[PDB]
């Protein structure tokens, strides 16, 4: 009766931050209740721990109030059979909302909307009579979003908030032998939502596991581990504090044993009863053991040395009541003298922020996915990850512990959408709610070695609540530093200056919360903390420009210990078309309102875990070996702090314009922080013209746990020499004929013919034989289909006049009209010479001026020479080159320049100069939100079909015009055009990326010279 919906729902606990839970057990590290020490030791599975994951019955309602009392007693006819865990939006019930800042619901704390999507889950299951004789049977939900009430066998059990941490209830007295039934009612919105405003899809449900754990009556209630070291780490102390619940009987003992493999390293036994703590005594229900470990193997992301710790609760006669365990990693984390140290050396964090996202499963995580992510990261030169912005699925820590990644664990607290940001975090009334989001995280994850820093949440301004919570942590677990960026990045609530999007060299001095240039921030008066960016280098779409600038500061300034790139995966979701064809969806694609569109796609990898090209630029910049070339000696520097180059080979090689002349291989013997000298054999040197390039690669000959054999971990290339070509071509056998007309000029020579339209001034067509080559005339191009960064936050509604695109738009770039100023043909001794001039103007303003000369010679080669003039007072153009639509469509593209991957000017350090050959398909980058892409810089020669262009340029080539790109919201809607679109740039502006909501292109990468010159040679084979 008092179990009635009617009664229960009445209190509206989900509209009250003063009730965060009802009848929930305390937090603690992961338990299994093994009843045999070996299983515990070997991490075998505990029969005392049962999963309730699977098929559950579910029914959706628009408001908690629309639930029928019946539900409590019996299933529902119309209840569907759903799989758990899952996100009900993933099943169709309601839509997922992709909003960033702006809260999904209306801001009226602590109220929530009356229309509040309720999901009723139910499960019928069996409890074995043995579980009811003794012990305690409790239930666990690893993640319920956002809040929920619970009934068992028609009785009300409890309530819980906090989507990202476990809620546990003792079912001990509601359970009946055999058949039991659970009724779980999950509310989408609650007062907890006010604290969960992270930039991500807004979903709901029982999205993490459900389990049953059977514990003895007298049991281990919690335990913590700690490791102290001596000056040189040659000796450690493992300290374990154990607490128990139940009746304390003198025959009770505890044994803590430390294994390393099969080998027991240390063991300790004792009975309950701690040291005197105060005037009343000590804890009789606790015991602390201390094990001495000589020459412990240390844990690090470089070498994840782990031990196993077993905690046995037994009686003195040797009888085991129960056992728990955890992996142990010996490491010390400290900030000392402005530096963050790990095991005494200073880290350089090569990290990334990662959300729990699956395109198919929404926010439900699985082992496979976790592992994939981990390996990609490790393969790509990452050390660390930040749990943006809440505690993750438990297994995560374990994997990191094991594979080796540093983890920053973060409280599930984000109130980004309040005004001001502080509003709740400065309010004592939210102190409790917040408090639980921090404390429980710590109680749960504190024993993992991978966790090296605690974070108070994200973007919730800076309030007195943070200060308190930060102090709490420091008191409770001084083993790790605390960080929080809110309120300016350097408040009293953080041990590290941890801004987001601070530029390297430029300051952004917003009122109250400026973002100084990182190099400058450190030397502000009185400042002494280390600086590590919590988010930097916004990887949204065609991005990552300038990435290297960061890497370089990091390397030059000690107190700049790296940062976390934003972010790992694109938060795109899968949708299906008219023919059961899938496609990547984003903000607002689910009729979701209000929404932030593409803003959910900032990953380095696509939702399927396939990489964006940016990923390489990272990989290379973050590489652990560094090179310098001096004469014919290569100096190698190791950035490893703990390990020796012991699975590393260096391959070297010399080549002249793509042609290999020499190769070597040399095994690296460099210690962490060491140098290795490498002298090369006498290097060949040819008479032939061209550039000679040295390229080196570090290879991992043997496979590791996260890499295959032959994995390349680093590389670098240098230009060694140049033999300039002092050779004049063979005087043409033939001579081209010029046929004039009033419409055009024709040039014929051989089967070849070229036509220039005298009215437009462009080369309108060309034939090889009877076949035409163009579909579109060759013409000047000064624009580009806007990248995400060019656009920023500019919308049709709300225009951002500062966004590059807006400027360009406003100035007429996109709609300027050419103007023939001149077009002449002249006959040279051995060639024809065409000469043109256009002016591009908009509203009587001449933006640019293009002046060319085409010169066709007996060789049947045309040489284009171009010279642009850009008005000082017009926004600098995105680019400067030509384009045209070719008639042909070939299978491959071959070029001699940077590649193989897409590379832009402020994003090309990872690319190598060489001869690349790839399929056309590979020259297009499927950024879900179409834009200019696929560029390759420093090209010297490009070959497509019978064409060959030569010079110094950047280019791109696909089946999509710039216009089509520019006009398609999703990549799935693009259609291949008639032939091949070719864009050949003499120059291209950088892509930026410091952030994606303000101009981020550094000046060095802006086409601001005024005068631009370039030349080409088009010809055939």
């Amino acid at each position, epitope marked *: 009766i008092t179990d009635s919906l009617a009664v229960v729902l009445q209190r509206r606990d989900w509209e009250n931050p003063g009730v965060t839970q009802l009848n929930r057990l305390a937090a603690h590290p992961p338990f299994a209740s093994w009843r045999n020490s070996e299983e515990a030791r070997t991490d075998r599975p505990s029969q005392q721990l049962r999963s309730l994951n699977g098929e559950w019955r579910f029914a959706w309602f628009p408001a908690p109030e629309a639930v029928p009392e019946s539900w409590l007693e019996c299933d529902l006819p119309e209840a569907d059979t759903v799989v758990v865990p899952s996100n009900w939006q993933m099943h169709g019930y309601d839509a997922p909302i992709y909003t960033n800042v702006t809260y999904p619901i209306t801001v009226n704390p602590p109220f929530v909307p009356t229309e509040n999507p309720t999901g009723c889950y139910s499960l019928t299951f069996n409890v074995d009579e043995s579980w009811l004789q003794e012990g305690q049977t409790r239930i666990i939900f690893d993640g319920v979003n956002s809040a929920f009430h619970l009934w068992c066998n028609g009785r009300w059990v409890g309530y819980g908030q906090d989507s990202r941490l476990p809620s546990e209830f003792d079912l001990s007295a509601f359970l009946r032998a055999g058949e039991n039934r659970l009724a779980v009612m999950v509310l989408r919105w609650s007062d907890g939502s006010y604290l969960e405003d992270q930039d991500m899809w807004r979903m709901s449900g029982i999205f993490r596991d459900v389990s049953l754990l059977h514990k003895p009556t007298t049991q281990i209630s919690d335990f913590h581990v700690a490791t102290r070291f001596n000056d040189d780490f040659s000796r450690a102390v493992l300290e374990a504090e154990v607490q128990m619940c139940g009746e304390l009987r003198d025959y009770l003992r505890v044994t803590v044993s430390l294994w390393q493999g099969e080998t027991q390293v240390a063991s300790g036994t004792a009975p309950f009863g701690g040291e005197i703590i105060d005037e009343r005594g000590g804890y009789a229900d606790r015991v602390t053991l201390r094990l001495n470990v000589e020459n412990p193997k240390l844990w690090s992301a470089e070498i994840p040395n782990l031990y196993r710790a077993v905690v046995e609760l037994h009686t003195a006669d040797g009888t085991l009541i129960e056992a728990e365990a955890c992996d142990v990693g010996f490491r010390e984390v400290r900030i000392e003298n402005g530096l963050l140290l790990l095991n005494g050396k200073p880290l350089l964090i090569r990290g990334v922020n990662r959300h729990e996202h699956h395109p198919l499963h929404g926010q439900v995580m699985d082992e496979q996915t976790m*592992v994939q992510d981990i390996l990609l990261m490790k393969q790509n030169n990452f050390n660390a990850v930040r749990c943006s912005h809440y505690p993750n699925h438990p297994l995560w820590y374990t994997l990191c512990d094991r594979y080796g990644l540093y983890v920053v664990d973060e409280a599930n607290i984000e109130t980004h959408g309040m005004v001001p940001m502080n509003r709740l975090t400065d309010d004592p009334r939210w102190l409790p709610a917040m408090s639980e989001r921090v404390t429980r995280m710590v109680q749960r994850d504190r024993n993992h070695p991978s966790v090296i820093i605690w974070s108070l949440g994200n973007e919730s301004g800076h309030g007195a609540n943070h200060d308190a919570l930060y102090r709490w942590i420091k008191s409770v677990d001084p083993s790790r530093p605390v960080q929080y960026e809110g309120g300016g990045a350097d408040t009293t609530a953080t041990d590290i200056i941890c801004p987001m999007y601070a530029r390297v060299d430029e300051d952004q001095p917003f009122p109250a919360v400026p973002k100084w240039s990182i190099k400058k921030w450190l030397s502000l008066p009185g400042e002494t903390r280390p600086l590590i960016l919590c988010e930097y280098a916004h990887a949204m779409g065609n991005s990552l420009g300038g990435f290297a600038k960061y890497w370089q500061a990091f390397r030059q300034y000690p107190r700049l210990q790296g940062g976390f790139v934003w972010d790992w995966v694109d938060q795109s979701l*899968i949708k299906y078309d008219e023919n059961g064809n899938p496609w990547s969806a984003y903000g607002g694609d689910f009729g979701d309102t209000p929404n932030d569109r593409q803003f959910c796609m900032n990953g380095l990898v696509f939702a399927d875990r396939t990489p964006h090209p940016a990923l390489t630029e990272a990989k290379h910049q973050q590489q652990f070996f560094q090179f310098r070339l001096s004469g014919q000696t290569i100096e190698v520097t190791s950035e490893y702090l703990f390990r020796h180059s012991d699975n590393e080979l260096l391959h070297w090689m010399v080549a002249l314009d793509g042609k290999p002349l020499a190769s070597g291989e040399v095994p690296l013997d460099v210690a962490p922080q060491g140098k290795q000298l490498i002298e090369l054999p006498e290097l060949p040197q040819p008479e032939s013209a061209g550039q000679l390039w040295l390229t080196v690669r570090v290879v991992q000959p043997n*496979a590791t746990a996260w890499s295959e054999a032959g994995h390349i971990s680093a590389w670098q290339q240098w230009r060694l020499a140049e033999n300039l070509s002092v050779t004049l071509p063979a005087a043409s056998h033939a001579i081209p004929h010029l046929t004039t007309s009033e419409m055009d000029f024709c040039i014929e020579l051989g089967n070849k013919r070229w036509q220039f339209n005298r009215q437009s001034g462009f080369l309108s067509q060309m034939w090889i034989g009877d076949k035409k080559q163009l579909l579109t005339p060759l013409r000047d191009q000064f624009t580009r289909a806007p990248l995400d960064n060019d656009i920023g936050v500019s919308e049709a509604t709300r225009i951002d006049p500062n966004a590059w695109v807006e400027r360009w738009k406003a100035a007429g770039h996109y709609q300027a009209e050419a103007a023939l100023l001149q077009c002449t043909a002249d006959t040279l001794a051995d060639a024809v010479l065409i000469t043109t001039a256009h002016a591009w103007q908009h509203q009587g303003k001449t933006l640019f001026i293009s002046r060319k000369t085409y010169r066709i010679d007996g060789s049947g080669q045309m040489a284009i020479t171009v010279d642009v003039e850009v008005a000082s007072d017009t926004p600098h153009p995105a680019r400067i080159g030509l384009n045209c639509q070719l008639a042909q469509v070939a299978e491959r593209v071959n070029w001699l320049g940077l590649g193989p991957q897409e590379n832009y000017p402020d994003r090309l350090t990872a690319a190598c100069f060489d001869r690349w050959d790839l399929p056309l398909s590979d020259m297009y980058t*499927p950024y879900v939100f179409p834009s200019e892409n696929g560029l390759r810089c420093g090209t010297r020669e490009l070959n497509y079909g019978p064409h060959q262009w030569r010079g110094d340029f950047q280019f791109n080539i696909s089946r999509y015009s710039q216009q089509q790109l520019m006009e398609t919201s999703h990549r799935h809607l693009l259609h291949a055009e008639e032939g091949t679109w070719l864009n050949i740039d003499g120059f291209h502006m950088g892509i930026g990326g410091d952030d994606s909501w303000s101009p981020s292109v550094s000046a060095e990468f802006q086409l601001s010279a005024g005068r631009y010159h370039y030349q080409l040679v088009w010809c055939q084979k």
Partner: antibody
Amino acid sequence: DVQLQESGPSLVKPSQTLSLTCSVTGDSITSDYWSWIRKFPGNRLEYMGYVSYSGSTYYNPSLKSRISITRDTSKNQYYLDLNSVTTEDTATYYCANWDGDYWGQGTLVTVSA
Amino acid sequence: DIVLTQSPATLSVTPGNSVSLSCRASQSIGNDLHWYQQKSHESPRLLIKYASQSISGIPSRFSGSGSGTDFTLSINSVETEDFGMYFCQQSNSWPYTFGGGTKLEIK
């Protein structure tokens, strides 16, 4: 609930292209990763490949570029195309989701002159 | 590629008795080892995933253990419906590969 079913020719000639269709009912093809697995007459199983949500494909190197896996959301089906088949391609072909929870009934395809 | 070797190739047992099947990887695959059952004229059925994780709808008598290179599938008190083929499959690295299989028969 979800159901998968293979369809297509049971007998093909050497050198031709073997093409099978996997019809998915109960849920959208955009809601999972899809695979093709085959069992050779001698009880040997081979994972041919799979297509994930982004459209990226993964093919077994043993298939020497003869394989193509595609999708059609409008028909809620995905396909397997194996070119230049030989007697070595005689096997029972199955479609299943990446998780391995849902499998088709399997269809025998014999390659004979 | 990763090679999975299963042993024994064939195992005969009398219903009621328990058995354990072995699967070893040529190199470490962490916990990415799954177990499948396959009967004549039928598609494979997933029994255990990621070395030891249980699957809804599978008899409780099936359990998995192991990590790295050595894994085991155990059947506590074999039933007649258990006779057939058992294959392990790794998903740690592409291409995914299957073991050669172990045939479980009545003795």
